[PDB]
Design a protein around this ligand. Structure first.
Ligand SMILES: CCCCCCCC/C=C\CCCCCCCC(=O)O[C@@H](COC(=O)CCCCCCCCCCCCCCC)COP(=O)([O-])OCC[N+](C)(C)C
Ligand SMILES: CC(C)=CCC/C(C)=C/CC/C(C)=C/CC/C(C)=C/C[C@]12O[C@@]1(C)C(=O)c1ccccc1C2=O
Ligand SMILES: *[C@@H]1O[C@H](CO)[C@@H](O[C@@H]2O[C@H](CO)[C@@H](O)[C@H](O)[C@H]2NC(C)=O)[C@H](O)[C@H]1NC(C)=O
Ligand SMILES: CC(C)CCC[C@@H](C)[C@H]1CC[C@H]2[C@@H]3CC=C4C[C@@H](O)CC[C@]4(C)[C@H]3CC[C@]12C
Ligand SMILES: *[C@@H]1O[C@H](CO)[C@@H](O)[C@H](O)[C@H]1NC(C)=O
Ligand SMILES: *[C@@H]1O[C@H](CO)[C@@H](O)[C@H](O)[C@H]1NC(C)=O
Lengths: 664, 35
């Protein structure tokens, strides 16, 4: 049939439920599933000290630390640091046994349960690969992936070289299709199509062949934005079919070899590289063992034809284990197509971008820049309005984008403060973000007490300001004003809502600052002189240095203005630094900032002409210290559980030993 | 002390760490030794 050799099945296979379980439990070769089982379990062994943070748990989950944590469920409190090393030990012995295939059902659950424990314990560590590694550990727990190239083959004779059902591939192929294709639907935004998200990426040296044919502005629009949209829309379509897989395996291996060097995304470019041969024929690791030399094949796994297994339906009515496998295929792949578009239900997690970051496959579609974060508490006993640090007890900077994390931060700051003589704070966040080169504006309302503010997960947040999408055509003019300035003048573009004001303190460093009104009507108040000034469109007003000023927005439309400022003490430093830069070659804090910059410039120069064999020899000693500290500090606390805690002078003797650079 | 800021540094609009916390080096030596 024309369809049956194209889709792999006939339309009559979908005509019943008994014929669908028979299709989705077809006896399929175990070999492609077991190489991905090795490559996923080996990339999770290398990921546990690096990105999961086993090297840096003592800095993150230390005992006695005042810290605002952001778990998904508020009842998730972490364990002591003595026991959080055991969670990362069980997760290591889970990923070690899932790599070898040794007690594979237990080793999957010993990895699946403490991965999704530490994943849900911090919402700020969520991204699209940390989500994916817990999906692939969730799938492979039910998949018979130890049916080839495993230690369970050496212990059990019915697990050695046995057939796997077809749904072990159709879920794994269905997953990597959803990672590719849904990301190509999320990149149909007007910021990714017009070329605003990841606009600086084309200036990397890896895009240098594309600049031999196109300009730097046309490399960004076509190759990065549209060549990452037409590739994500057509990656899982090209890898699926037989006529276009060898072409499609080239475009997606080039896509992930670039993203391994452009971005620091951990093992995401290697997990998406190890999962692309799942779309190949399932006998491809038997075809490479047979292509090996003969004395090499005794160390490789078996090349013989697979034995019949229980988990497959042979041409026999299917039992319970076969019916639960075809039901897991249709229910999971429909659930994976719904959560990137389930943002209409969880409307409390909805901000400027829809939903919480991590599970929507909107990778690099929205980039931000925070101009000003200002936390104003208010002492409930005295009324003394004070000002907190911008990032006090947090271990990240993702709370300033999300309304759920701002409520967790305002609640956590309501209990922590009383240790610092603030009994019941009233906490106002004034956070200025601009998404994808837009105007800087307040994302959260700065007048509402975020402690007593009403955030609910299923209702829309009332104190999140609307993203001014009507000022998005202004961005073509904002690159014109930014280009019209010299090397000394910096500009900050700001849009403020009606009824609000911006209290700004110009430093004494910033002489010759000016505010120009682009759209609307603002009235700039000088606080010390107590004098107002109403601005018109295009009118410029000089602002005093070292003083306060407030910009009251009085237009019915959201007003646009800009801060054209220049750091004069930075000038007076650099015109006096260039004075003795030429005076030195003709032959007292100023000489200290001078000499530290010249040895800095010889450091940046020496970093550029170092040989490539020393950058890779330093990369391994940077990495082997991460694997040495994560192992030695584990046994420091694993001794604290079995043999108990030692004296504190002895605990110093091991931690300074564990913090030693090995060969540096 | 270090958890607060003045209204000259907090009102300025234009203006792997994990260990520059507030009570870090006191709680580090408590639940470790004098490292
Ligand atoms: C002119 C007509 C063109 C029609 C095109 C229509 C658009 C097509 C777009 C291609 C989309 C690519 C998605 C990748 C998923 C792979 C699934 C899979 O491997 O199929 C396997 C079984 O197939 C089944 O078991 C069918 C049961 C459906 C389960 C998945 C439903 C997901 C949606 C849930 C809700 C419902 C067959 O795999 P195979 O036989 O072992 O090898 C592949 C054969 N090949 C190499 C020849 C390809
Ligand atoms: C002339 C034309 C028209 C095409 C030429 C060839 C071509 C093919 C170019 C692609 C070039 C690259 C390199 C673009 C990187 C930009 C990007 C879009 C990054 C985001 C990414 O972050 C990821 C890198 C990632 O790994 C990923 C994985 C799975 C799905 C989606 C993704 C992602 O979207
Ligand atoms: C300059 O003008 C602004 C706005 O026209 C004044 O700000 C108002 O101040 C009063 C009292 O402080 C508030 O009740 C109003 O809500 C403010 N207006 C807005 C739009 O918020 C400011 O007081 C004026 N300053 C001087 C010195 O006249
Ligand atoms: C709390 C400690 C004991 C760990 C318990 C493990 C639980 C909470 C974990 C393990 C497996 C996880 C599931 C794995 C896969 C998915 C599919 C994803 O699309 C939504 C989340 C969901 C449904 C996870 C929900 C949370 C989960 C059930
Ligand atoms: C302030 O900076 C602007 C920037 O172009 C410049 O035109 C103006 O002359 C400067 N004013 C003074 C007093 O230096
Ligand atoms: C101006 O430059 C000086 C350089 O000595 C720097 O210390 C200061 O922070 C700068 N001011 C601003 C507002 O960036």
């Amino acid at each position: 049939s024309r369809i049956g050799k194209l889709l792999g099945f006939e339309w009559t296979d979908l005509s019943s439920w008994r014929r669908l379980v028979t299709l989705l439990n077809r006896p399929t070769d175990p070999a492609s599933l077991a190489v991905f089982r090795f490559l996923f379990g080996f990339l999770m062994v290398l990921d546990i000290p690096q990105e999961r943070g086993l090297s840096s748990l003592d800095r993150k989950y230390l005992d006695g630390l005042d810290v605002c944590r952001f778990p998904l469920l508020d009842a998730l409190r972490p364990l002591p640091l003595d026991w959080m090393y055991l969670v990362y030990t069980i997760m290591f012995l889970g990923a070690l046994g899932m790599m070898l295939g040794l007690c594979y059902r237990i080793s999957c659950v010993l990895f699946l349960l403490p991965y999704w424990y530490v994943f849900l314990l911090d919402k700020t560590s969520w991204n699209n690969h940390s989500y994916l590694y817990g999906l692939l550990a969730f799938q492979l727990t039910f998949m018979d992936a130890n049916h080839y190239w495993s230690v369970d083959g050496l212990l059990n004779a019915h697990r050695r070289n046995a057939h796997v059902p077809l749904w072990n591939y159709a879920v794994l192929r269905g997953q990597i299709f959803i990672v590719y294709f849904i990301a190509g639907v999320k990149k149909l935004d007007a910021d990714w199509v017009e070329g605003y998200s990841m606009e600086y990426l084309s200036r990397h040296w890896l895009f240098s062949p594309f600049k031999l044919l196109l300009s730097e502005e046309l490399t960004s629009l076509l190759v990065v934005h549209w060549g990452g949209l037409l590739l994500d829309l057509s990656a899982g379509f090209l890898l699926f079919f037989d006529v276009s897989r060898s072409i499609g395996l080239f475009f997606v291996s080039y896509f992930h070899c670039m993203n391994s060097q452009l971005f620091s995304i951990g093992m995401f470019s290697y997990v998406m590289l190890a999962s692309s041969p799942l779309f190949c024929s399932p006998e491809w690791p038997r075809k490479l063992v047979s292509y090996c030399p003969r004395r090499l094949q005794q160390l490789l796994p078996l090349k013989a034809a697979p034995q019949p297994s229980v988990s497959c339906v042979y041409k026999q009515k299917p039992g319970l284990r076969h019916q639960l496998g075809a039901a897991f295929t249709l229910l999971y792949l429909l659930e994976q197509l719904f959560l990137p578009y389930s943002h209409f239900l969880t409307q409390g997690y909805n901000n400027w971008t829809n939903g919480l970051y991590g599970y929507s496959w909107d990778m690099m579609v929205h980039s931000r820049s925070h101009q000003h974060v200002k936390i104003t508490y208010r002492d409930g006993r005295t009324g003394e309005l004070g000002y907190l640090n911008p990032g006090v007890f947090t271990q990240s900077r993702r709370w300033k984008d999300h309304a759920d994390m701002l409520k967790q931060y305002a609640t956590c700051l309501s209990r922590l403060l009383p240790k610092y003589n603030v009994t019941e704070p009233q906490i106002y966040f004034d956070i200025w973000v601009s998404i994808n080169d837009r105007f800087q504006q307040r994302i959260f309302d700065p007048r509402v007490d975020i402690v007593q503010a009403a955030w609910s997960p299923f209702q829309r947040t009332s104190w999140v300001q609307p993203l001014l999408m009507d000022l998005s055509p202004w961005r073509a003019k904002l690159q014109e004003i930014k280009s019209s300035l010299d090397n000394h003048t910096e500009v900050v573009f700001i849009a403020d809502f009606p009824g609000l004001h911006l209290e700004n303190f110009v430093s004494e460093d910033l002489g010759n600052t000016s505010i120009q009104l682009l759209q609307g009507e603002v009235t700039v108040e000088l606080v010390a002189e107590q004098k107002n000034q109403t601005l018109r469109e295009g009118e410029k007003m000089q602002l005093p240095a070292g003083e306060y000023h407030k910009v009251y927005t009085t237009s019915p439309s959201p007003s646009c203005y800009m801060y054209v400022y220049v750091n004069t003490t930075e000038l007076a430093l650099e015109q006096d630094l260039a004075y003795l830069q030429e005076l030195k070659e003709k032959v007292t804090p100023l000489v200290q900032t001078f000499l530290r910059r010249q040895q800095r410039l010889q450091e940046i120069e020496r970093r550029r002409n170092t040989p490539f064999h020393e950058r890779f020899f330093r990369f391994l000693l940077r990495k082997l210290y991460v694997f040495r500290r994560s192992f030695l500090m584990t046994c420091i606390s694993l001794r604290n559980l079995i043999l108990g805690r030692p004296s504190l002078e002895q605990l110093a003797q091991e931690v300074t030993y564990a913090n030693l650079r090995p060969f540096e | 002390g270090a958890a607060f800021v003045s209204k000259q540094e907090g009102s300025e609009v234009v203006k792997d760490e994990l260990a520059d916390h507030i009570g870090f080096q006191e709680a580090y030596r408590r639940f470790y030794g004098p490292v």
